[PDB]
Assembly symmetry: D2
Homo-oligomer: 334 residues x 4
């Protein structure tokens, strides 16, 4: 139904596409990137991380074709030159990683979009939503530049409000052992971040993250209670959040675990999941959910300090969320 | 000066040997392993992680020759056939990972040895020592079979000691993002631990650790206050401990890093090091210290909860304490 | 239909079990390994390389259950104790890597089986066969202990047969850039081959291969015209064969490739494949054929020296051929 | 002694520096890069492949201070605004990887430099030289923009010269299993080459090379007689060349090895190396020669078709050649 256009057909841009391939409620009609249609078609069809695209992929001049549907390929390095209105695009997915400041994202509105979704933490955005935590706070007539936050945050928010609603978080620290992304370097090179300037596939890399405190944007009640860091390791995909929290109540591992298992099958069904199996990162490559609790890992100390570990496919889970936000936003009418 | 024997010329036994080549107080007169002399000489000469040994290594007859000294090479799969007494070996390093029970390790004393150092946490050992934390409690009369603990406990114990001495640890949880070891599997194959059964270089593999609990064998007060887990990632060496604790008194990062820094410059010098550089895992490959504090990563929340991330080369650092402890043992009188 | 047994539920074993799930002609009734039903069930459904099994895996007693079919699990380290006869097993896939000698594998025939397929190069086998090259030389009366050869010989035979019957080979060299396997070490350790002693995921490891000379066993007139080498690199699966051969006839790239493509579409369909695409190794992960010609790599020098580069999933393509061989054997008579 | 300037302090630039510190004949006085001084003083000191620089690296304003000596750090993206003359730079190493064409690399000459060495193959350069095979063809009067070829041509030519002079190379094909470099992608992303567009640390990536055709530039005797390709694989540094050629004469494995060894000890000492140890790639990380023969791999079929394998540290070997070339040029009187 709703027509979508993607700006930056990259790891998140093509996976959002693959995700949207299914959902007939939305319709990807155009993509924009610095590459040629012939390159974008190849990278869309063969993925080193998720395999082959099961669909018919081809080029019609300078236009993509996938299962009959022809997709428009644009190449404006400047969003203002996009002409969304012309082609009739309603919602635009801003996944270049270059336009997360309102000042660059709003161009899409001026060019004729109705709404804009930023697949990363934005600046001066109208609102930040984590499907499962605050999508209910989306005002159609007031919010147009929308941020879907970061993958880590989408992973941590769901199980944080659940421990908070039932036991109440006093404070907590989080680490994310995360897979390397295209923002790091193959071999040693310059990066605004001297950590990320180091060969990504050779070391464990300490780095910062805004995910933990940015949780207060979706769950205000937790403002100033969390903080955290990250560590990039030698795997191309899949991450795991590690949270240690000081609880307001005395629990047992069996209590902390039943809570999450309840919400995962209840309120949070489809976004939050639960597992009692001893799985490893490769096992989660393809997981469309945001957060998967590893029950075998839950621990409690003195009945008041808890450790909850949760998995998350940083490209797929996150890619299915962008598409879920698109449809939600859409259903509220543009 | 005092003769030493190495049982199990593995990552740990060869590494302790390199360390020991530069220690005037000890002297490795013989090594026992299932492998032959050529193989052992080649693996001693070329190391994929630590590089080529700066020494002249050869195989004369059945014995290794290193810089003139001739090392005795055995192949007795049974500790009591070793005859350490015949050659006059006083301290025997047990690094096969098979003899971790006092009784099994006691077999070296049977054979002529006076002291046995197990390069691993043990079962009913005489005393467990973490250089810098409790080697003072070593009695030359009552203790014969000593455990040097694990590489993780050696990294955590020293800074927990300082945080508890200065601020007081109410309780804490830990996580060691550890490199893979020989105990893991190249590709999916049988294994006691179903997590460790999976390909080591392919995934982020959550697993267990006794390190956190084991701290108490060296730091009594913290009994029941620490706990933690392990995450083995695709790096071949160098690991990192991540401690999140609730302190007694309200601290600030400045206080936390200052107390650590000071302890690193005095009492704990040589064992505990402090770094304010934005470094990564490859950088500590070859460190002799048991724990280098990542000061840039220190953080606190609500003035009572801190996070302290520390580095430790698992092979080299630990190897240097085995040699350290053995020489401390030799000084106490045998 | 045919009842089948597997000895050694490892990399080839579990993969042959997965391939046989498609085959109608055979049926795997019992498996034997050192690992128990519970571990065997886990590793079966969860694979770091091939994914989650898309079937229902359950365990009952010491048996497995996949899609309602109870499979029998044994743990006889000695082959003559399996008793294939009491359970109707006609075919036995020898994949432990231990019983390659005709005299050991023959233990299965002493157990009640009628045919044994050794998943590897053999010593004294009745006949060695590469499907598509010489399956026709199989005599159901004379051959009981068949060698299916190596994954490398299966990749190389099919197009060496074409190049030879087509243009004529005089002499050639081959190198297989190959993924690491379970015969190597995670971290620097003892091994008969001092090259396979080095940390597998860390280096480019040169090693020997008999795959070149083994091709004369099934392509007789190629006796002494070939030889080659191997180089294990840091990828968990999928390999490539690089063949430089001097021909009898003058040729051109265009002709060399036309000859391969034709066979891929006629003669060797299912065994041989042709690729015009600039894909990489991870893209062939799951390829069922034995060899896919990277047609973009074919080269000619002085119109007599050729270079053909073929890809092959060492685990998948091989396994399917094990299933095929089994089904063929059953078709000629049993 | 001879003042040298580096344009582009990347992988080859930083290494060329490190090597330069050993030679007093040259003195690196200036370096140009897009990255800041503080970022360069970090990447220089800490290296994920080659470890820490054994030196005092400091920052002064926006210049480097290394072992007392201050280096002027420039930041001009355009080579014509570099002013190499105002600072006394005689020789300029062009290692940005973007100025491989005369019209661009000439700008340094117009800017004040006397000689230019391009750290890669070039187009329309005054002359292309591989040390030890044709540096005598240098004309200090006619040659100013000098190409130092690639790391591969550097490895392959000196021994190709030996084999050809000695036995006679009718024709031959080559393959270089090569470590990944900074021209690749960490994760599937746009690239001119769709092979290099794929996730670098995850696959075997067949790619192109001109190395084979380039030998002819330095050994015209071998024009149209060689050709080859590249296999980029998941290691961070150190590569290997696999040459398979035809000979006019009939040799034996010993016949060929005696000659490579002889050459290594005679005419080609320092440039070519010979080895009888079963080493692996990490064993060559740090090597300063351009070519080390894996003598355990020489193969001969019929006495006419030979296979020779040679290792090469692509970063270090090449950079010591660059420093060397800068010494020869100077030696002739700029
Ligand atoms: N990779 C992950 O796991 C992940 C997950 C969630 C969010 N994100 C966020 O998604 C955004 C994109 O990240 P990515 O990981 O996909 O990186 P990426 O490099 O794959 O994607 C960038 C895409 O943007 C294109 N591009 C950049 N500027 C362009 C321009 N001006 N015009 C046209 N095309 C342009 C690039 O060609 C590329 O194809 C970032 O904000 C990132 O923080 C990444
Ligand atoms: N490697 C590290 O990162 C690390 C750190 C600290 C402690 N440890 C502990 O050190 C011990 C050894 O571990 P490692 O990591 O070096 O493993 P490893 O597998 O490299 O070494 C085992 C050595 O003992 C040999 N061996 C086995 N049985 C023997 C026998 N019966 N007689 C003589 N020699 C025999 C093996 O061949 C091998 O050389 C274990 O207890 C381990 O848990 C490991
Ligand atoms: N993986 C490949 O690429 C590949 C390809 C072709 C041929 N092969 C060959 O087939 C054989 C299997 O190799 P793999 O790669 O599957 O190895 P693997 O290590 O994954 O499997 C070996 C298995 O045999 C079991 N086993 C060993 N001895 C046993 C015994 N005596 N009784 C019962 N079970 C036993 C082990 O528990 C293990 O699961 C080897 O000969 C190998 O060289 C492997
Ligand atoms: N990596 C090796 O093994 C190797 C070996 C032989 C030849 N080469 C060639 O050497 C050259 C350098 O390759 P690399 O591997 O060092 O890559 P690199 O990216 O690590 O280094 C290139 C440096 O030049 C800088 N640079 C780019 N444009 C610049 C500009 N306009 N002005 C100033 N500085 C600029 C970049 O920021 C970077 O630091 C390339 O031609 C490469 O192909 C590399």
């Amino acid at each position: 139904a709703v027509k979508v256009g993607i700006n930056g057909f990259g790891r998140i841009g093509r996976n959002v596409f693959r995700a949207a391939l299914k959902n007939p409620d939305i319709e990807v009609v155009a993509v924009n990137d610095t590459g040629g249609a012939n390159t974008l078609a190849h990278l869309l069809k063969y993925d080193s991380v998720h395999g082959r695209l099961d669909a018919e992929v081809s080029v019609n001049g300078n236009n993509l074709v996938v299962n009959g549907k022809e997709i428009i390929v644009k190449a404006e390095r400047d969003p203002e030159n996009l002409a969304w209105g012309e082609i009739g695009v309603d919602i635009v997915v801003e996944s270049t990683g270059r336009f997360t400041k309102r000042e660059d994202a709003a161009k899409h509105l001026e060019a004729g979009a109705k709404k804009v979704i930023i697949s990363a933490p934005a600046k001066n955005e109208d609102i930040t939503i984590v499907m499962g935590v605050n999508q209910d706070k989306y005002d159609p007539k007031a919010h147009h530049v929308i941020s879907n936050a970061s993958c880590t945050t989408n992973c941590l928010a769901p199980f944080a409000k659940v421990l908070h609603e039932q036991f109440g978080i006093v404070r907590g620290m989080m680490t994310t052992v995360h897979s390397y992304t295209n923002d790091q370097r193959i071999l040693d090179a310059s990066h605004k971040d001297l950590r990320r300037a180091r060969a990504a596939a050779e070391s464990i890399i300490p780095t910062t993250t805004g995910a933990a405190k940015a949780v207060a944007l979706v769950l205000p009640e937790l403002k100033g209670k969390l903080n955290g860091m990250a560590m990039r390791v030698p795997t191309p995909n899949v991450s795991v959040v590690d949270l240690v929290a000081e609880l307001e109540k005395e629990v047992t591992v069996e209590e902390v675990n039943a809570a999450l298992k309840a919400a995962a099958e209840g309120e949070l069904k489809g976004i939050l999941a639960y597992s009692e199996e001893p799985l490893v990162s490769r096992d989660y490559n393809g997981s469309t959910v945001s957060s998967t609790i590893d029950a075998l890992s839950t621990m409690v100390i003195d009945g008041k300090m808890v450790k909850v570990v949760s998995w998350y496919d940083n490209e797929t889970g996150y890619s299915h969320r962008v598409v879920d936000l698109a449809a939600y936003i859409a259903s509220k009418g543009l």
